[PDB]
Design a protein around this ligand. Sequence first.
Ligand SMILES: [Mg+2]
Ligand SMILES: [Mg+2]
Lengths: 588, 588
Amino acid sequence: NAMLYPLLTKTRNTYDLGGIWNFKLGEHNPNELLPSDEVMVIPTSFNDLMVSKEKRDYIGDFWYEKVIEVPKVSEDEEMVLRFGSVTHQAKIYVDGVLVGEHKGGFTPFEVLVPECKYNNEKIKVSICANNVLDYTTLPVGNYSEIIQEDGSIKKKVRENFDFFNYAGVHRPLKLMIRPKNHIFDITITSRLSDDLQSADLHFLVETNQKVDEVRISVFDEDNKLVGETKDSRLFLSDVHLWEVLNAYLYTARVEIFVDNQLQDVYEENFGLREIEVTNGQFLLNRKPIYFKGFGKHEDTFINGRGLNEAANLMDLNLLKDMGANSFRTSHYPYSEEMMRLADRMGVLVIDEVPAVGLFQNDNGTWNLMQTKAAHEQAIQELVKRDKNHPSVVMWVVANEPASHEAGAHDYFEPLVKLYKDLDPQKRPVTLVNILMATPDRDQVMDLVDVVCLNRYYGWYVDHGDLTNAEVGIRKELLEWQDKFPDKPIIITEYGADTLPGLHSTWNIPYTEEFQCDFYEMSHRVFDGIPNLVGEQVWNFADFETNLMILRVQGNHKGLFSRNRQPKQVVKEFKKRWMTIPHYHNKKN
Amino acid sequence: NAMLYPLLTKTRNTYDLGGIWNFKLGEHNPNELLPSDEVMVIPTSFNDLMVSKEKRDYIGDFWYEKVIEVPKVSEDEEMVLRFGSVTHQAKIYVDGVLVGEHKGGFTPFEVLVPECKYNNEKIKVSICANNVLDYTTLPVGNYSEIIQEDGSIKKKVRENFDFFNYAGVHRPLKLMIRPKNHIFDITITSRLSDDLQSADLHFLVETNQKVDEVRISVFDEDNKLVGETKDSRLFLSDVHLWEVLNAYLYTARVEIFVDNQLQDVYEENFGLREIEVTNGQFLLNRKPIYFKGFGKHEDTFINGRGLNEAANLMDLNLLKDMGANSFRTSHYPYSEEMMRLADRMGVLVIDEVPAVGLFQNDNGTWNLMQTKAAHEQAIQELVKRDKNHPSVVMWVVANEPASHEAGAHDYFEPLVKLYKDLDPQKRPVTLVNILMATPDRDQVMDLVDVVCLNRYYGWYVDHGDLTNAEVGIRKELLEWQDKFPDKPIIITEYGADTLPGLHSTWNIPYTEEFQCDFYEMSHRVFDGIPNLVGEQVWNFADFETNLMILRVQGNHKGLFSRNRQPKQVVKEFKKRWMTIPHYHNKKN
Ligand SMILES: [Mg+2]
Ligand SMILES: [Mg+2]
């Protein structure tokens, strides 16, 4: 139900509830008042703000609590709490009463404040967050309980993924006063003309109640009126297209009317562009694109997975300065803020649900992977939240699932359909593939539009041995190309752990020089694979992980450090990506 | 035949041949003259002096060559070339003629220069070194050949050990002019009195030819004469014992005589001390010792495995400043220079042969481990070279062999006997044990006097999880103690990779703080195991290895960096080891 970015309009009062909240790890009676012994900030991951390991590794319930003043709410209005997200599960209390609930740590939801409380001076909001991951959650966790002889129970999650399980309220929480009868959803659809110069627009507006009139006023980047309709249909002559690294955004002001008066007004941006996949190519505006960019993480010192709009912008500025043009939201939906920024900057985005960890670890006879419900929900929420973004060019169903094992096809078949059935634009959906699932073994890739591969020849296979890595990477890309002559291929991950300061004359893995050598070898291969249409390094920047022997205080495959300072290899990518055009047809 | 340290005496002219030699990787006709295009230094590993990887990774023949002036050699003398060692195999040429040969990269050998060449002005010395490791060599290598389509053959060695395969002439080469009839060997034996105040000495002098008289003059540390014998027997009243960190060395001047005149004179040092193992204790001078120190490597920037006497001393100074008292020559005999220094400083030494890598990697039906010959030779050479060192308190037969697999017992049974049969002092022999070979599985430890364990709970098992590591380490030491109530236990390796500069509040492996935490947990366990009589960290200093994913530009488990700068944890060891006395009886 929370699919619309919270805006301030003359009919919608939006209040930011961020700041300091009373805070507690562990159990709490929401009928009672949390002390100010512990506090926590909203938004931010809580983990790094803890000074001890035991606290940073806490798993279970933890609470945020604040007494909040009730604004003026008129008879025809209602009041909702709107969360960008709570990680991973959340129960929301008003005055000690359970009033809403959510599962999924990376998508927004709203919670209605009971009408009977609108004439009160104050309300106490209590948020019971929970950071347990399961075989029933996304991402997938290995959950276990050990009794302490205390004998309290210690909960722990052995992540089935390579990123630290940051938890907390990572995204802005809003107190939202809006009309009872309001605009629930807006879907924007366009059919571009033969020559790509005009657009037949369809604005599909959802309401809960009867409306007399629905006026839509479209404005261009100069805020000049260029179209108006009362029937949901608009024809725009001589449009400006949304082009890679050269964005053009229209904004659709939607006003609804009952009995000759404004009931609700919302402003939704859209961009005009066409996506197609054919002949081993990714077409944007009917021209062949070459992806260059990064797998990313929402990760930063101090804030962990919490939203930092300034990091979004610093990254995006660097991306574009490098000559890059895209990135993937690995391994979970990013914040709305980041999406709106990619739109504004013309950056291509591969948008993914948190389906990472779908891989067991004899044996497995019993049904342990109960992920289907969460998966279906994740897909619905992402498409409903993100479908209007011109920057979203493709969906990902999973990252590195066990796609070579029996039962894989039948799990993904309906989920891929779901993206198609839900996306008005029917964008391509992909599946990101692990090295184990080789062309012969894999049994899922027939279902998808674009082949995405994470490959580390010269790092995990043939470690530090480029001569043989080259033969391996080339061999496999040729098998993929052959098995699917039709589909485009995108390297969604490739890189090499690199610690700033480590140096060698002898191409030594972990040194800055080896990072350069690794990418040279990789690009020499890619450039000779006709159906390979894009390359996205892992990772943009170094990032936090859990304790595992092959992680040297986090992942270090970043071109930048966690503090966003460049490694040696950045100069090299800048020379390469400024030489390859965005609209680059190889083939030729 | 090269068991005596090369000394200058009035009968023995010893010339250092070190410096610049013509040098070539690859094939060479020793009848022809190597150009001065390439040069190399003696002594040093060649690898790090190569600017390209292909050269640094070279495997096969490589040559050193120099024209050398012939000194005056009288009719009763002979001239030999004496090598501290050549790594790994060596063939020696004089004037293009093969004149001697050696296998084993860490022990000394001599090569007679043909008498017919003594009246020549010059001789050309050619050294064909070879750095191939095999299933027939020690250390054990995984050897393979791939044809290049050049089509030359690329030789490569996949080390079966965790240290970089440095090769070259690592130790001083001497041109040695000595009497035809000379002192070949001196073995020093002592029986100390009941109260440890006197010593019955037996000096066993080997000659090749008849001698009329053998006079032995013993001098104390003040060069004062305290004993003299002509019958090989000497009784010394009121001796000064060689004590841990408080060394006392006598020196035995051995003179031989034919027909009333000096034929040869040699000076051999010895120290007086008694070693015994009983009741789960290691007795030195009949008092229980507690080992504190390091596994080491002969490793240093630039020089690789080449001899650097100043590094020996800087390490030893640090060792003793820390309150430590021992170290192991892992994983190969150190230079004579280091041994003589340990004697002079009172440091205990566990002396080992290069028997590392005795572990396969289905299957194995065929006899692939042909290591027995090399093993027997290594043992003979080490005992013959090192038996007189008071600092050598124990022998190691192997490091981390597959001692849990069938056939292990029968391989080691005769090799352990060999140490006993060869060592006049019958010192303890041990075997250093890998984690796979657990008390139940292991089948070799009954053969040995002292239990040595390399254990990494909290690093390889239970990575970064101290709570569980503690239970594991304790559990296993209790099983060992139980299975062998008789034998002392020594932790010969324990530590944690640590990169200088990496820091965290949250006990994160690879950070300096975690290194400290890891050792605290380990010592808390050790202190409660009555039969554990010693602790030797891995490693003294960071060191070079080959390319393998869990090696971040070498091994970083060192308390010091490769440049010998301290990590955080050094302060901690200094507090602990200065509090534990050398003669420390736990039990109690
Ligand atoms: Mg199953
Ligand atoms: Mg066999």
